[PDB]
Design an enzyme around this catalytic site. Sequence first.
Site, PDB file in Angstrom:
ATOM      1  N   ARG A  46      78.456  66.863 -25.833  1.00  0.00           N
ATOM      2  CA  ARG A  46      79.309  65.808 -26.397  1.00  0.00           C
ATOM      3  C   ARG A  46      78.794  64.429 -25.961  1.00  0.00           C
ATOM      4  O   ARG A  46      78.611  64.184 -24.764  1.00  0.00           O
ATOM      5  CB  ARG A  46      80.777  66.004 -25.973  1.00  0.00           C
ATOM      6  CG  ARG A  46      81.762  65.086 -26.688  1.00  0.00           C
ATOM      7  CD  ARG A  46      83.194  65.439 -26.338  1.00  0.00           C
ATOM      8  NE  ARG A  46      84.154  64.645 -27.106  1.00  0.00           N
ATOM      9  CZ  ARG A  46      85.442  64.945 -27.240  1.00  0.00           C
ATOM     10  NH1 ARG A  46      85.944  66.034 -26.667  1.00  0.00           N
ATOM     11  NH2 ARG A  46      86.239  64.163 -27.956  1.00  0.00           N
ATOM     12  N   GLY A  47      78.561  63.560 -26.944  1.00  0.00           N
ATOM     13  CA  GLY A  47      78.074  62.201 -26.742  1.00  0.00           C
ATOM     14  C   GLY A  47      79.073  61.148 -27.179  1.00  0.00           C
ATOM     15  O   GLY A  47      80.225  61.471 -27.494  1.00  0.00           O
ATOM     16  N   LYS A  48      78.628  59.874 -27.196  1.00  0.00           N
ATOM     17  CA  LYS A  48      79.446  58.724 -27.586  1.00  0.00           C
ATOM     18  C   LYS A  48      79.703  58.726 -29.096  1.00  0.00           C
ATOM     19  O   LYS A  48      80.858  58.594 -29.526  1.00  0.00           O
ATOM     20  CB  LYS A  48      78.785  57.409 -27.131  1.00  0.00           C
ATOM     21  CG  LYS A  48      78.874  57.145 -25.629  1.00  0.00           C
ATOM     22  CD  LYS A  48      77.812  56.139 -25.105  1.00  0.00           C
ATOM     23  CE  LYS A  48      78.073  54.674 -25.420  1.00  0.00           C
ATOM     24  NZ  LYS A  48      78.014  53.805 -24.206  1.00  0.00           N
ATOM     25  N   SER A  50      78.509  61.425 -31.143  1.00  0.00           N
ATOM     26  CA  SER A  50      78.237  62.805 -31.568  1.00  0.00           C
ATOM     27  C   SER A  50      78.888  63.910 -30.704  1.00  0.00           C
ATOM     28  O   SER A  50      79.411  63.635 -29.622  1.00  0.00           O
ATOM     29  CB  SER A  50      76.731  63.042 -31.660  1.00  0.00           C
ATOM     30  OG  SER A  50      76.081  62.827 -30.417  1.00  0.00           O
ATOM     31  N   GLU A  51      78.841  65.165 -31.228  1.00  0.00           N
ATOM     32  CA  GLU A  51      79.300  66.443 -30.663  1.00  0.00           C
ATOM     33  C   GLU A  51      78.296  67.492 -31.161  1.00  0.00           C
ATOM     34  O   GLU A  51      78.060  67.585 -32.374  1.00  0.00           O
ATOM     35  CB  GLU A  51      80.711  66.784 -31.166  1.00  0.00           C
ATOM     36  CG  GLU A  51      81.784  66.775 -30.090  1.00  0.00           C
ATOM     37  CD  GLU A  51      83.216  66.806 -30.604  1.00  0.00           C
ATOM     38  OE1 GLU A  51      83.510  67.596 -31.532  1.00  0.00           O
ATOM     39  OE2 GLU A  51      84.052  66.048 -30.063  1.00  0.00           O
ATOM     40  N   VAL A  52      77.644  68.211 -30.237  1.00  0.00           N
ATOM     41  CA  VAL A  52      76.614  69.191 -30.574  1.00  0.00           C
ATOM     42  C   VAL A  52      77.163  70.614 -30.458  1.00  0.00           C
ATOM     43  O   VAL A  52      77.884  70.946 -29.515  1.00  0.00           O
ATOM     44  CB  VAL A  52      75.294  68.959 -29.793  1.00  0.00           C
ATOM     45  CG1 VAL A  52      74.241  70.001 -30.148  1.00  0.00           C
ATOM     46  CG2 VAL A  52      74.752  67.556 -30.061  1.00  0.00           C
ATOM     47  N   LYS A  67      74.791  68.967 -35.191  1.00  0.00           N
ATOM     48  CA  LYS A  67      75.208  67.710 -34.560  1.00  0.00           C
ATOM     49  C   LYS A  67      76.152  66.936 -35.480  1.00  0.00           C
ATOM     50  O   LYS A  67      75.716  66.368 -36.488  1.00  0.00           O
ATOM     51  CB  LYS A  67      73.991  66.866 -34.149  1.00  0.00           C
ATOM     52  CG  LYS A  67      74.337  65.556 -33.429  1.00  0.00           C
ATOM     53  CD  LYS A  67      73.099  64.662 -33.442  1.00  0.00           C
ATOM     54  CE  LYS A  67      73.216  63.466 -32.554  1.00  0.00           C
ATOM     55  NZ  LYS A  67      71.876  62.896 -32.285  1.00  0.00           N
ATOM     56  N   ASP A 155      65.561  56.674 -25.319  1.00  0.00           N
ATOM     57  CA  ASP A 155      66.647  57.364 -24.594  1.00  0.00           C
ATOM     58  C   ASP A 155      66.159  58.615 -23.908  1.00  0.00           C
ATOM     59  O   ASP A 155      66.865  59.607 -23.913  1.00  0.00           O
ATOM     60  CB  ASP A 155      67.905  57.637 -25.464  1.00  0.00           C
ATOM     61  CG  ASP A 155      69.196  57.855 -24.669  1.00  0.00           C
ATOM     62  OD1 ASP A 155      69.246  57.445 -23.474  1.00  0.00           O
ATOM     63  OD2 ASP A 155      70.143  58.460 -25.225  1.00  0.00           O
TER      64      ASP A 155
HETATM   65 CL1  LIG Z   1      63.528  67.238 -19.230  1.00  0.00          CL
HETATM   66  C1  LIG Z   1      64.486  68.393 -18.365  1.00  0.00           C
HETATM   67  C2  LIG Z   1      65.677  68.806 -18.929  1.00  0.00           C
HETATM   68  C3  LIG Z   1      66.481  69.730 -18.276  1.00  0.00           C
HETATM   69  C4  LIG Z   1      67.763  70.221 -18.903  1.00  0.00           C
HETATM   70  N1  LIG Z   1      68.269  69.331 -19.949  1.00  0.00           N
HETATM   71  C5  LIG Z   1      69.681  69.570 -20.252  1.00  0.00           C
HETATM   72  C6  LIG Z   1      70.000  69.366 -21.717  1.00  0.00           C
HETATM   73  C7  LIG Z   1      71.442  69.723 -22.066  1.00  0.00           C
HETATM   74  C8  LIG Z   1      71.837  69.453 -23.497  1.00  0.00           C
HETATM   75  C9  LIG Z   1      72.469  68.270 -23.847  1.00  0.00           C
HETATM   76  C10 LIG Z   1      72.838  68.026 -25.158  1.00  0.00           C
HETATM   77  C11 LIG Z   1      72.581  68.959 -26.137  1.00  0.00           C
HETATM   78  C12 LIG Z   1      71.954  70.138 -25.802  1.00  0.00           C
HETATM   79  C13 LIG Z   1      71.584  70.383 -24.492  1.00  0.00           C
HETATM   80  C14 LIG Z   1      66.065  70.211 -17.046  1.00  0.00           C
HETATM   81  C15 LIG Z   1      64.872  69.797 -16.481  1.00  0.00           C
HETATM   82  C16 LIG Z   1      64.052  68.880 -17.134  1.00  0.00           C
HETATM   83  C17 LIG Z   1      62.766  68.478 -16.499  1.00  0.00           C
HETATM   84  C18 LIG Z   1      61.678  69.347 -16.476  1.00  0.00           C
HETATM   85  C19 LIG Z   1      60.487  68.976 -15.878  1.00  0.00           C
HETATM   86  C20 LIG Z   1      60.361  67.735 -15.293  1.00  0.00           C
HETATM   87  C21 LIG Z   1      61.427  66.862 -15.307  1.00  0.00           C
HETATM   88  C22 LIG Z   1      62.619  67.228 -15.906  1.00  0.00           C
END
Ligand SMILES: Clc1cc(C[NH2+]CCCc2ccccc2)ccc1-c1ccccc1
Length: 326
Positions: A46-48, A50-52, A67, A155
Amino acid sequence: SGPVPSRARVYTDVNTHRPSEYWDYESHVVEWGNQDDYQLVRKLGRGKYSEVFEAINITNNEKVVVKILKPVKKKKIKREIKILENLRGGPNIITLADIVKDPVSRTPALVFEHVNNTDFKQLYQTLTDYDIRFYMYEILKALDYCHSMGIMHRDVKPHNVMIDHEHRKLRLIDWGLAEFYHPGQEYNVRVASRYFKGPELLVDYQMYDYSLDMWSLGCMLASMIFRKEPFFHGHDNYDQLVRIAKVLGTEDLYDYIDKYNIELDPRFNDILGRHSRKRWERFVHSENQHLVSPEALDFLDKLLRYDHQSRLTAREAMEHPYFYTV
Ligand SMILES: Clc1cc(C[NH2+]CCCc2ccccc2)ccc1-c1ccccc1
Protein backbone atom coordinates in the site's frame (compact mmCIF):
# COMPACT_ATOMS: atom_id res chain seq x y z
CA SER A 1 23.64 34.82 -11.73
CA GLY A 2 22.23 31.50 -10.43
CA PRO A 3 23.28 27.80 -10.38
CA VAL A 4 25.75 26.45 -12.99
CA PRO A 5 24.05 24.09 -15.55
CA SER A 6 24.81 20.33 -15.53
CA ARG A 7 24.00 17.37 -17.77
CA ALA A 8 24.25 13.55 -17.62
CA ARG A 9 27.66 12.06 -18.59
CA VAL A 10 25.79 9.18 -20.41
CA TYR A 11 22.59 8.90 -22.53
CA THR A 12 22.46 12.74 -22.58
CA ASP A 13 20.48 13.30 -25.79
CA VAL A 14 18.65 9.90 -26.11
CA ASN A 15 15.26 11.66 -25.80
CA THR A 16 16.10 14.83 -27.82
CA HIS A 17 16.88 12.48 -30.82
CA ARG A 18 13.52 10.64 -30.57
CA PRO A 19 10.02 11.54 -31.72
CA SER A 20 7.50 13.51 -29.67
CA GLU A 21 5.31 10.43 -29.19
CA TYR A 22 8.00 8.58 -27.20
CA TRP A 23 8.32 11.26 -24.49
CA ASP A 24 5.17 13.44 -24.64
CA TYR A 25 3.09 11.51 -22.12
CA GLU A 26 0.56 14.37 -21.73
CA SER A 27 -0.52 13.70 -25.37
CA HIS A 28 -0.26 9.84 -25.04
CA VAL A 29 -3.64 8.12 -25.43
CA VAL A 30 -4.38 5.61 -22.69
CA GLU A 31 -6.73 2.78 -23.62
CA TRP A 32 -7.79 0.29 -20.96
CA GLY A 33 -9.93 -2.83 -20.94
CA ASN A 34 -12.54 -4.24 -18.58
CA GLN A 35 -11.37 -5.17 -15.07
CA ASP A 36 -14.09 -7.97 -15.02
CA ASP A 37 -11.42 -10.39 -16.38
CA TYR A 38 -9.43 -10.16 -13.08
CA GLN A 39 -10.18 -11.41 -9.55
CA LEU A 40 -8.21 -9.96 -6.61
CA VAL A 41 -6.49 -12.62 -4.41
CA ARG A 42 -4.56 -10.71 -1.64
CA LYS A 43 -2.91 -7.36 -0.74
CA LEU A 44 0.89 -7.17 -1.30
CA GLY A 45 1.52 -3.51 -0.39
CA ARG A 46 0.00 0.00 0.00
CA GLY A 47 1.35 3.40 -1.14
CA LYS A 48 0.31 7.08 -1.16
CA TYR A 49 -1.34 6.98 -4.63
CA SER A 50 -1.68 3.12 -4.93
CA GLU A 51 -2.57 -0.37 -3.44
CA VAL A 52 -0.81 -3.49 -4.83
CA PHE A 53 -2.55 -6.88 -5.12
CA GLU A 54 -1.94 -10.42 -6.18
CA ALA A 55 -4.71 -11.32 -8.64
CA ILE A 56 -5.95 -14.03 -10.97
CA ASN A 57 -6.78 -13.64 -14.63
CA ILE A 58 -9.94 -15.82 -14.83
CA THR A 59 -9.56 -16.45 -18.62
CA ASN A 60 -6.23 -18.34 -18.23
CA ASN A 61 -5.87 -19.17 -14.44
CA GLU A 62 -2.58 -17.19 -14.34
CA LYS A 63 -1.46 -15.18 -11.29
CA VAL A 64 -0.74 -11.46 -11.91
CA VAL A 65 0.17 -8.33 -9.90
CA VAL A 66 -2.55 -5.63 -9.93
CA LYS A 67 -1.78 -1.99 -8.94
CA ILE A 68 -4.93 0.06 -8.24
CA LEU A 69 -4.23 3.77 -8.89
CA LYS A 70 -5.77 6.34 -6.48
CA PRO A 71 -7.03 9.09 -8.89
CA VAL A 72 -4.25 11.71 -8.67
CA LYS A 73 -3.25 14.16 -11.53
CA LYS A 74 -4.14 12.48 -14.89
CA LYS A 75 -0.72 13.55 -16.28
CA LYS A 76 0.93 11.52 -13.44
CA ILE A 77 -1.07 8.34 -14.39
CA LYS A 78 -0.26 9.03 -18.11
CA ARG A 79 3.47 9.49 -17.32
CA GLU A 80 3.74 6.14 -15.44
CA ILE A 81 1.79 4.22 -18.16
CA LYS A 82 3.94 5.75 -20.95
CA ILE A 83 7.10 4.97 -19.03
CA LEU A 84 5.97 1.36 -18.31
CA GLU A 85 5.04 0.87 -22.02
CA ASN A 86 8.42 2.23 -23.17
CA LEU A 87 10.32 -0.06 -20.70
CA ARG A 88 7.97 -3.11 -21.07
CA GLY A 89 10.20 -6.21 -21.30
CA GLY A 90 13.50 -4.60 -20.25
CA PRO A 91 15.84 -6.61 -17.95
CA ASN A 92 14.51 -6.74 -14.34
CA ILE A 93 11.78 -4.14 -15.09
CA ILE A 94 8.25 -4.90 -13.83
CA THR A 95 6.40 -5.96 -17.05
CA LEU A 96 3.04 -4.23 -17.66
CA ALA A 97 0.64 -6.91 -19.06
CA ASP A 98 -2.59 -4.85 -19.24
CA ILE A 99 -4.37 -1.66 -18.20
CA VAL A 100 -7.95 -1.83 -16.95
CA LYS A 101 -10.75 0.07 -15.24
CA ASP A 102 -13.45 -1.28 -12.96
CA PRO A 103 -16.81 -0.60 -14.69
CA VAL A 104 -18.56 0.79 -11.58
CA SER A 105 -15.76 2.61 -9.68
CA ARG A 106 -14.13 3.90 -12.95
CA THR A 107 -10.80 3.51 -10.99
CA PRO A 108 -7.76 2.81 -13.25
CA ALA A 109 -5.57 -0.24 -12.53
CA LEU A 110 -2.30 -1.60 -13.91
CA VAL A 111 -1.68 -5.32 -14.50
CA PHE A 112 1.86 -6.72 -14.27
CA GLU A 113 3.65 -10.06 -14.74
CA HIS A 114 3.50 -12.04 -11.48
CA VAL A 115 6.48 -11.84 -9.06
CA ASN A 116 6.46 -13.99 -5.89
CA ASN A 117 8.20 -11.65 -3.36
CA THR A 118 10.25 -13.05 -0.46
CA ASP A 119 9.89 -11.11 2.90
CA PHE A 120 12.33 -8.12 3.35
CA LYS A 121 12.24 -8.37 7.20
CA GLN A 122 13.09 -12.14 6.75
CA LEU A 123 15.51 -12.14 3.72
CA TYR A 124 18.89 -11.52 5.54
CA GLN A 125 18.51 -15.10 7.07
CA THR A 126 20.49 -16.70 4.20
CA LEU A 127 21.49 -13.44 2.33
CA THR A 128 25.25 -13.92 1.81
CA ASP A 129 28.03 -11.64 0.42
CA TYR A 130 27.42 -13.36 -3.00
CA ASP A 131 23.60 -12.70 -2.82
CA ILE A 132 24.14 -8.96 -2.32
CA ARG A 133 26.61 -8.78 -5.30
CA PHE A 134 24.19 -10.89 -7.43
CA TYR A 135 21.06 -8.80 -6.66
CA MET A 136 23.04 -5.50 -6.89
CA TYR A 137 24.11 -6.54 -10.46
CA GLU A 138 20.46 -7.34 -11.32
CA ILE A 139 19.38 -3.84 -10.20
CA LEU A 140 22.22 -2.29 -12.28
CA LYS A 141 20.92 -4.17 -15.41
CA ALA A 142 17.51 -2.50 -14.83
CA LEU A 143 19.15 0.92 -14.23
CA ASP A 144 21.46 0.95 -17.27
CA TYR A 145 18.45 -0.19 -19.28
CA CYS A 146 15.95 2.53 -18.16
CA HIS A 147 18.74 5.20 -18.28
CA SER A 148 19.58 4.04 -21.93
CA MET A 149 15.84 4.61 -22.60
CA GLY A 150 16.06 8.20 -21.25
CA ILE A 151 14.25 7.47 -17.99
CA MET A 152 15.36 8.02 -14.42
CA HIS A 153 13.46 6.02 -11.76
CA ARG A 154 13.81 8.74 -9.01
CA ASP A 155 12.48 6.33 -6.25
CA VAL A 156 15.11 3.55 -5.92
CA LYS A 157 14.68 1.94 -2.41
CA PRO A 158 14.21 -1.61 -0.95
CA HIS A 159 10.37 -1.25 -1.00
CA ASN A 160 10.59 -0.71 -4.86
CA VAL A 161 12.67 -3.85 -5.49
CA MET A 162 10.73 -7.17 -5.58
CA ILE A 163 12.82 -10.33 -5.06
CA ASP A 164 11.70 -13.97 -5.69
CA HIS A 165 14.70 -15.54 -3.84
CA GLU A 166 13.72 -19.19 -4.76
CA HIS A 167 14.07 -18.36 -8.50
CA ARG A 168 16.71 -15.55 -8.04
CA LYS A 169 14.27 -13.21 -9.80
CA LEU A 170 14.38 -9.45 -9.19
CA ARG A 171 12.06 -6.64 -10.44
CA LEU A 172 12.41 -2.84 -10.08
CA ILE A 173 8.83 -1.60 -9.49
CA ASP A 174 6.76 1.58 -8.87
CA TRP A 175 7.57 3.80 -11.81
CA GLY A 176 5.05 6.41 -10.49
CA LEU A 177 7.82 9.00 -9.76
CA ALA A 178 9.90 8.17 -12.87
CA GLU A 179 10.58 10.83 -15.52
CA PHE A 180 12.07 11.40 -18.97
CA TYR A 181 15.50 12.97 -18.84
CA HIS A 182 15.85 16.09 -21.04
CA PRO A 183 19.27 17.86 -20.69
CA GLY A 184 18.95 21.26 -19.00
CA GLN A 185 15.41 20.54 -17.72
CA GLU A 186 14.71 21.65 -14.12
CA TYR A 187 12.91 18.99 -12.13
CA ASN A 188 10.86 18.98 -8.94
CA VAL A 189 13.30 17.96 -6.12
CA ARG A 190 10.35 16.57 -4.07
CA VAL A 191 11.08 13.03 -5.37
CA ALA A 192 12.42 9.73 -3.85
CA SER A 193 11.99 8.71 -0.21
CA ARG A 194 13.82 10.90 2.44
CA TYR A 195 16.57 8.32 3.33
CA PHE A 196 17.41 7.76 -0.37
CA LYS A 197 17.35 11.43 -1.52
CA GLY A 198 20.54 12.51 -3.23
CA PRO A 199 22.34 15.66 -1.99
CA GLU A 200 21.18 17.45 -5.23
CA LEU A 201 17.52 17.22 -4.07
CA LEU A 202 18.27 18.35 -0.49
CA VAL A 203 20.28 21.44 -1.62
CA ASP A 204 17.39 22.19 -4.09
CA TYR A 205 19.59 21.69 -7.24
CA GLN A 206 16.93 21.06 -9.93
CA MET A 207 19.14 20.16 -12.96
CA TYR A 208 19.79 16.51 -11.87
CA ASP A 209 19.91 13.35 -14.05
CA TYR A 210 20.26 9.47 -14.03
CA SER A 211 23.06 9.77 -11.33
CA LEU A 212 20.33 10.49 -8.72
CA ASP A 213 19.37 6.73 -9.00
CA MET A 214 23.00 5.77 -8.40
CA TRP A 215 23.08 7.73 -5.09
CA SER A 216 19.86 5.91 -3.98
CA LEU A 217 21.52 2.58 -5.04
CA GLY A 218 24.57 3.40 -2.89
CA CYS A 219 22.21 4.01 0.10
CA MET A 220 20.71 0.54 -0.41
CA LEU A 221 24.14 -1.11 -0.69
CA ALA A 222 25.46 0.61 2.49
CA SER A 223 22.37 -0.53 4.49
CA MET A 224 22.77 -4.09 3.17
CA ILE A 225 26.52 -4.58 3.72
CA PHE A 226 26.57 -2.70 7.10
CA ARG A 227 23.15 -4.08 8.39
CA LYS A 228 22.08 -0.51 9.27
CA GLU A 229 18.57 0.41 7.95
CA PRO A 230 18.48 3.13 6.82
CA PHE A 231 22.13 4.14 6.40
CA PHE A 232 21.45 7.94 6.43
CA HIS A 233 18.70 8.38 9.06
CA GLY A 234 17.40 11.91 8.66
CA HIS A 235 14.29 13.00 10.58
CA ASP A 236 13.37 15.67 8.00
CA ASN A 237 14.73 16.80 4.55
CA TYR A 238 17.16 19.34 6.15
CA ASP A 239 18.42 16.81 8.76
CA GLN A 240 18.94 14.26 5.94
CA LEU A 241 21.79 16.41 4.47
CA VAL A 242 23.29 16.67 8.04
CA ARG A 243 23.29 12.83 8.32
CA ILE A 244 25.10 12.58 4.97
CA ALA A 245 27.53 15.42 6.06
CA LYS A 246 28.37 13.37 9.28
CA VAL A 247 29.80 10.67 6.96
CA LEU A 248 31.04 12.52 3.82
CA GLY A 249 32.15 15.68 5.68
CA THR A 250 31.29 19.38 5.34
CA GLU A 251 34.46 20.33 3.26
CA ASP A 252 33.38 18.21 0.21
CA LEU A 253 29.80 19.51 0.69
CA TYR A 254 30.95 23.15 0.30
CA ASP A 255 33.23 22.07 -2.59
CA TYR A 256 30.05 20.64 -4.32
CA ILE A 257 27.81 23.70 -3.65
CA ASP A 258 30.72 25.99 -4.87
CA LYS A 259 31.20 23.84 -8.04
CA TYR A 260 27.55 24.25 -9.09
CA ASN A 261 27.07 27.71 -7.44
CA ILE A 262 24.19 26.39 -5.23
CA GLU A 263 22.84 28.72 -2.52
CA LEU A 264 22.07 26.77 0.70
CA ASP A 265 18.72 27.35 2.48
CA PRO A 266 18.90 29.37 5.78
CA ARG A 267 17.42 26.30 7.59
CA PHE A 268 20.93 24.71 7.21
CA ASN A 269 22.69 27.59 9.10
CA ASP A 270 22.08 26.26 12.66
CA ILE A 271 22.14 22.49 11.93
CA LEU A 272 24.92 21.69 9.42
CA GLY A 273 27.94 22.14 11.73
CA ARG A 274 31.52 20.97 10.91
CA HIS A 275 32.21 17.31 10.20
CA SER A 276 35.26 15.42 9.01
CA ARG A 277 35.11 12.88 6.17
CA LYS A 278 34.80 9.40 7.77
CA ARG A 279 36.49 6.15 6.54
CA TRP A 280 34.02 3.45 5.31
CA GLU A 281 35.87 0.98 7.63
CA ARG A 282 34.31 2.88 10.59
CA PHE A 283 30.96 1.09 9.84
CA VAL A 284 32.35 -2.49 10.06
CA HIS A 285 31.33 -4.62 13.12
CA SER A 286 30.98 -8.29 14.17
CA GLU A 287 27.38 -8.40 12.91
CA ASN A 288 28.25 -7.21 9.33
CA GLN A 289 31.95 -8.11 8.70
CA HIS A 290 30.93 -11.32 6.76
CA LEU A 291 29.34 -9.00 4.07
CA VAL A 292 32.11 -6.33 3.84
CA SER A 293 35.24 -6.56 1.58
CA PRO A 294 37.75 -3.96 0.21
CA GLU A 295 35.86 -4.31 -3.19
CA ALA A 296 32.46 -3.57 -1.52
CA LEU A 297 33.93 -0.50 0.22
CA ASP A 298 35.65 0.77 -2.96
CA PHE A 299 32.41 0.32 -4.95
CA LEU A 300 30.42 2.12 -2.22
CA ASP A 301 32.89 5.03 -2.07
CA LYS A 302 32.35 5.63 -5.86
CA LEU A 303 28.57 5.74 -5.57
CA LEU A 304 28.14 7.86 -2.44
CA ARG A 305 29.70 11.12 -3.70
CA TYR A 306 28.13 14.57 -3.28
CA ASP A 307 29.06 15.46 -6.88
CA HIS A 308 26.41 13.71 -9.03
CA GLN A 309 28.88 13.84 -12.01
CA SER A 310 31.64 12.00 -10.07
CA ARG A 311 29.39 8.96 -9.26
CA LEU A 312 29.80 5.77 -11.35
CA THR A 313 27.18 5.39 -14.15
CA ALA A 314 25.20 2.07 -14.06
CA ARG A 315 27.37 0.77 -16.96
CA GLU A 316 30.63 1.71 -15.16
CA ALA A 317 29.31 0.10 -11.90
CA MET A 318 28.79 -3.23 -13.77
CA GLU A 319 32.55 -3.28 -14.60
CA HIS A 320 33.66 -2.85 -10.92
CA PRO A 321 35.77 -5.71 -9.35
CA TYR A 322 32.98 -6.17 -6.70
CA PHE A 323 31.04 -8.02 -9.47
CA TYR A 324 33.95 -10.21 -10.79
CA THR A 325 32.54 -13.18 -8.75
CA VAL A 326 29.05 -12.91 -10.36
CL1 LIG B 1 16.54 -4.21 -3.35
C1 LIG B 1 16.10 -5.26 -2.04
C2 LIG B 1 14.75 -5.45 -1.79
C3 LIG B 1 14.35 -6.28 -0.75
C4 LIG B 1 12.88 -6.54 -0.49
N1 LIG B 1 12.01 -5.52 -1.08
C5 LIG B 1 10.67 -5.53 -0.49
C6 LIG B 1 9.59 -5.19 -1.50
C7 LIG B 1 8.18 -5.30 -0.93
C8 LIG B 1 7.08 -4.89 -1.87
C9 LIG B 1 6.56 -3.61 -1.83
C10 LIG B 1 5.54 -3.23 -2.69
C11 LIG B 1 5.03 -4.13 -3.59
C12 LIG B 1 5.54 -5.41 -3.64
C13 LIG B 1 6.56 -5.79 -2.79
C14 LIG B 1 15.32 -6.90 0.02
C15 LIG B 1 16.67 -6.70 -0.23
C16 LIG B 1 17.08 -5.88 -1.28
C17 LIG B 1 18.54 -5.71 -1.53
C18 LIG B 1 19.29 -6.73 -2.11
C19 LIG B 1 20.64 -6.58 -2.33
C20 LIG B 1 21.28 -5.41 -1.98
C21 LIG B 1 20.56 -4.39 -1.40
C22 LIG B 1 19.20 -4.54 -1.18
